């Protein structure tokens, strides 16, 4: 009746038998028009999956929705090569390693970076930083700013920043998330969160607990990858090792995954985690007061 | 009369 | 309620209607007595490098082409709980069986699973979706099977109530392939190295195969459990085209 | 009352001290002549045994029941010789081994040679088959019709089928059976099971469940072995290894268990599980497109 | 109510109509003191190639038979766990001993016992026959005592069930054995080579009888747990016509 | 009824 259909139209779909959401759509046209009118049917099964919500649509819808797949410059040209243009949206890339290796500094690098137009008509956007490590430094920022000639305080107005306390705190804050996409449509490109399971691993530190924990754990995965499908973003995570934490959980959940270690002196590696040992899925970049960047 | 398959050697319209 | 038994003569009349789609490799199809088989559900397992993706893909075109016994084609519904499914990869294939982009990727459904809760929800719509275009589809691609069911129930106490969902979703999957006559292809993932699912997973599955890397580019498949013999086994190749033969 | 007891004469009973149904049964003619006559006491003490059925029947009315008892030849006289003339009536015969084994192929010859008029005046009769593994094909039973000289519409009528998807309803099947028994008394002569197990082991796959898949496993079984005596049918099931599946509720059940397993080349051989290592306990056969046969 | 006691005298008077059948072979009589003893339960284990079915099967004809110290003969009840009583094995050793095959057939009741709780109810028809034709019944046999406990309580946590309602059924055919004058006489499985049970059917059995393979066709009856010693073991053969003596 | 064949 919400959506426009009839009192007496809705009580017809009853005497037959019809008294579920779920008993409208699953019933075919051709036996919804021996109760009635194929004009009135494509009303009634309009209305049904809007409510329910299939989730039924052509390879070549989705192949429309793939085309808006892009992809955010890591500041390497080697880096971005090793992950076919850089972090890609409409998936969540997770990066783990020691804490020498530059799991903040792309972390922070990214946030310009996503502001920049960039390859295949990127536009450049705003970003959402959740931090659970108390590891963002918004002067960290300038730096990374300079070397892309880019002005402070517009990096830092486009960036949106939230510390979560909690593995409560930080499944809520996922909601503010949503609702902030939602508002701004196809303003924000990038969601960070540094780091995705520390928390999770400080609430459930018995292993009674662990059975809660993996339940929480990937129902904020699931909402992650939801996020990150539905409102076309990039949603790059953090990680510690123990190997990464968060077991087949959070290897499911991310498309790509991404071992940091260091390498000569001051140059680091990125390698793709559980890939065979060969030179294509692994590249070389640099750290500096400018971000994550090229060899010299 | 029923709704046959015709595969996808026609280009669509 | 009677839900009755049937003649074996009216359970021959059933299964006249069976059919098989080809997998693109002749050598392959001759191990599997034809192909993907319908009234049926077949697994492949293996590494993430061998062609379960590729023969996911290359089943997506193959299921829409007329094949041998005079299979007509029909359309295909993908559920993806990997986030591996790329109409993209299905165009070269098109373009290898000399059809139309736009027509393949119309004649595909699909569907991201989220949850196991989620991907047996999406078969109650796989269900109805088959009964509403009656004898238009003829696969049925869930790639993988399983992986949303190890990640919902990653405890050891929460075992008895994964097994029983499995279990569920398994058997609902066997009668929408019986009632409905179409192939249900299924991928799965390996933990020796075996497929995970226990008993629940090899009772469901009619034919199981195993996927590896052969010389070079090359790859075998070959029916799981079954003894060291050559008859038991199948070399084949992966191409921008999809599954196909060796040079 | 039912049977045509007086209404007088059911309450001099309850005086005394009878009040039950089990009462009525284990008191004796010696006894119940003193609450009466003995013309009196042979309808109450008929009546009883009618609602109770203490099961006693004397060995020469066992005798006349086992007069009855069938083979239903294998297709191999090898195989019948050690088995005594093939799958006996009013007993349960499991057969098991590894898949490329002649198990499927003994289910499916069994549908046919059920079907022809055998030794010891065997009349033939039809067969129902529960199927738990999605293995049977009817037209492989063309073939074995085909090397017996025998039509395949009729093969293929006179066998009734069902899938098994749970074990419940595996369970559920075996009343269905048991009332097409009751039907056409005389009719069928084989009831297949193939496999057995299966079901079990996939809808109690934890090792808590165990207890009560080992309860309602023993229920079916109890039940099957009632069916093949009370209406004398051949019950023939396959089962798994991993040594057969099941333990020591599947050993009791059947009273004849073959072992199946490959001999030279295309060769086949089948033993009776825990017998001594003897010759006489062996048999070689053969297994063609026409099912199971004699070696060349 | 007053269950109370009775004197040496009375006990005397009562142990005065102990009977023993024989069990076909002289040898194994000396053994037991003169065969299968009344007021008493008999339990005879092995090995399945041993003769526990040929002694079931013997004694359903020589307890039919006058015997020794003025046993006149009786009736006997099978209850059969293991679908192993075959009446045409009686006409073998009926022929043996000079009697009628359907006079021996129709002084055998025969009951086959499903489940456990099923064999447990039995034992009430049992008591209820013998309290009808008093005297008339001289032999019970159980064969097997124990298989349906096994089967009905499979598992760890049903042991202590499993264990109450096997010492319930024992009892119970300890009181029938004595209260009713007949000899009990039973078969059972081993799982070393030692008998099913534990302490609760070797207390309920009075005499425990281990049966094995001895040279050729010759077997060897022992007592069990006894020394070793010759006095405590015997030699017999079995022929067509039962349990009887060596050539 | 039973056709035999
Ligand atoms: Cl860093
Ligand atoms: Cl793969
Ligand atoms: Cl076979
Ligand atoms: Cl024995
Ligand atoms: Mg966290
Ligand atoms: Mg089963």
Redesign the interface.
């Given at each position: 009746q919400k959506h426009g259909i009839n009192v007496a139209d809705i009580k017809k779909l009853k005497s037959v038998g019809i008294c579920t959401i779920?008993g409208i759509?699953?019933t075919?046209?051709?036996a919804l028009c021996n109760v009635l009118s194929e004009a009135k049917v494509d009303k009634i099964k309009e209305a049904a999956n809007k409510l329910i919500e299939?989730?039924?649509?052509?390879?070549?819808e989705?192949?429309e929705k793939?085309k808006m797949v892009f992809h955010i410059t890591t500041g390497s040209q080697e880096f971005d090569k090793l992950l076919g243009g850089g972090i890609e949206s409409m998936?969540i890339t997770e990066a783990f390693g020691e804490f020498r290796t530059g799991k903040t500094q792309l972390s922070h690098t990214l946030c310009v970076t996503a502001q920049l137009p960039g390859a295949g008509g990127y536009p450049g956007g705003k970003i959402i930083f959740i931090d659970t490590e108390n590891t963002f430094r918004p002067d960290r920022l300038r730096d990374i700013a300079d070397r892309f000639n880019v002005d402070h305080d517009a990096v830092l107005d486009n960036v949106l920043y939230a510390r979560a306390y909690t593995s409560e705190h930080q499944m809520e804050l996922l909601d503010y998330v949503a609702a902030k996409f939602h508002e701004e449509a196809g303003i924000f490109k990038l969601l960070i969160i540094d780091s995705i399971m520390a928390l999770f691993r400080v609430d459930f530190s018995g292993r009674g607990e662990?059975?809660e924990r993996?339940?929480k754990l990937?129902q904020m995965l699931?909402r992650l990858?939801?996020i990150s499908?539905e409102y076309n973003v990039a949603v790059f995570v953090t990680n510690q090792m123990t190997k990464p934490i968060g077991?087949?959980?959070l290897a499911?959940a991310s498309?790509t995954r991404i071992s940091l270690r260091k390498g000569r002196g001051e140059l680091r590696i990125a390698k793709i985690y559980?890939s065979?040992e060969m030179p294509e899925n692994e590249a070389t970049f640099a750290i500096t007061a400018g971000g994550i960047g090229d060899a010299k | 009369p029923t709704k046959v398959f015709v595969p996808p050697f026609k280009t669509k319209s």
């Amino acid at each position: 009746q919400k959506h426009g259909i009839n009192v007496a139209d809705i009580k017809k779909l009853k005497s037959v038998g019809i008294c579920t959401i779920k008993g409208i759509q699953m019933t075919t046209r051709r036996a919804l028009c021996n109760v009635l009118s194929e004009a009135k049917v494509d009303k009634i099964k309009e209305a049904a999956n809007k409510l329910i919500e299939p989730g039924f649509l052509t390879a070549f819808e989705y192949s429309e929705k793939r085309k808006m797949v892009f992809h955010i410059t890591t500041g390497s040209q080697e880096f971005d090569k090793l992950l076919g243009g850089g972090i890609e949206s409409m998936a969540i890339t997770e990066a783990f390693g020691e804490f020498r290796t530059g799991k903040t500094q792309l972390s922070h690098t990214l946030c310009v970076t996503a502001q920049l137009p960039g390859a295949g008509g990127y536009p450049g956007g705003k970003i959402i930083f959740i931090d659970t490590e108390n590891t963002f430094r918004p002067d960290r920022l300038r730096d990374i700013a300079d070397r892309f000639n880019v002005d402070h305080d517009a990096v830092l107005d486009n960036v949106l920043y939230a510390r979560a306390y909690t593995s409560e705190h930080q499944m809520e804050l996922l909601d503010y998330v949503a609702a902030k996409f939602h508002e701004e449509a196809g303003i924000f490109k990038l969601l960070i969160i540094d780091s995705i399971m520390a928390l999770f691993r400080v609430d459930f530190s018995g292993r009674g607990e662990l059975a809660e924990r993996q339940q929480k754990l990937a129902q904020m995965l699931s909402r992650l990858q939801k996020i990150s499908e539905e409102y076309n973003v990039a949603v790059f995570v953090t990680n510690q090792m123990t190997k990464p934490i968060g077991g087949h959980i959070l290897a499911h959940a991310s498309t790509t995954r991404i071992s940091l270690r260091k390498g000569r002196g001051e140059l680091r590696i990125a390698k793709i985690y559980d890939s065979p040992e060969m030179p294509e899925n692994e590249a070389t970049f640099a750290i500096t007061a400018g971000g994550i960047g090229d060899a010299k | 009369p029923t709704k046959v398959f015709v595969p996808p050697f026609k280009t669509k319209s």
